[model samples]
Target: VMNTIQQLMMILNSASDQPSENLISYFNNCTVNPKESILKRVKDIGYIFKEKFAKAVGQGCVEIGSQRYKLGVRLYYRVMESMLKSEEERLSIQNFSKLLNDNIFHMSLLACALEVVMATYSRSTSQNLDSGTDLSFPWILNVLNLKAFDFYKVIESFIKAEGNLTREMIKHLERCEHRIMESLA
Candidate 1:
């Protein structure tokens, strides 16, 4: 009973209200607005964090673990920001990343922000996407969901077979990605 009292008392002082320096740094470099393609999907899907965390390989707010545990394309906040078309969207992605930072449950939010960027890239390349015309060009968005860990598996699968994959097969994989994203929705 005495130990329980001590633990409860400890909890009283454990609530935190500050963003980490790392997150602040990331926020300064990132954006809070999303782009057109993301707007299109999120219009039907949802919003950032609502308004997310990435790993700490130079882009995440939280830094723990090895590269092996790292996920997301353009995992670095700056890289993701660079891929975005609008300054507003870049800011939005940054804001969402900072908001979701420091929470394990918010990985999906990070994934969502990345999905926005990927969609934006697809739009920016619409003119050059002759082969990507069919809708399988950006294969990364297909794996996003609540289970951020599981998201890593499909990305790995694509990376693993990139050399062996044919143009037709890659398109199939891209279609599969869209199918998975749709099913999850």
Candidate 2:
């Protein structure tokens, strides 16, 4: 009873407040076509990342833009972790290195790797509690919700839309990943 009274007297503090209305709209307006042709998907995602990186990665806000597109592409592998059909289809950490070594350049295998990085950023991070970064980093826990999606059509079509994935796009998706990582380090 004494311990409970002490605990009840304690106060908990967490970051509060939301980002600007314009900021939220900026992300919401960043249009996407999940079914858009995969032929140029890589270029599309990369361009979007570069455009937004201009603001998010830099200090001080100056006409900030979208995180959904960049994250949708950047968190590809993380998102892919959930889209698998069964345990056997999942990539184990140990085997991933070898798997990438062999199929790293494969367009088919590289497919749709770039669709969730930015999305993860917006949904989880992007909060304005006066955190240093205008960006908020979302952990991988909710990665599968709006981003991981499905490989081939299933119930995803009814909920979240699936984009037109291709070999080249996945292969090219790697380019931005390297740049994002470099900036990260």
| CA lDDT of each prediction against the hidden true structure | 0.34, 0.31
58-107 in candidate 1: lDDT tens per residue? 24313221111122222322222333224345465434544323232234
lDDT of 2 by residue, 86-146 (tens): 3224443222322223222222222333232232222234345212343322212122222
**Model 2 lDDT at residue 49:** 50
TM agreement with the true structure for every prediction: 0.24, 0.24
Off by over 4 Å in 2: 1-36, 56-74, 87-132, 137-185
lDDT of 1: 0.34
Error of 2 at 158 (Å): 16
In angstroms, how far off is 49's CA in candidate 2?
1.9
Tell me, what's the RMSD of every candidate? 19.2, 18.8
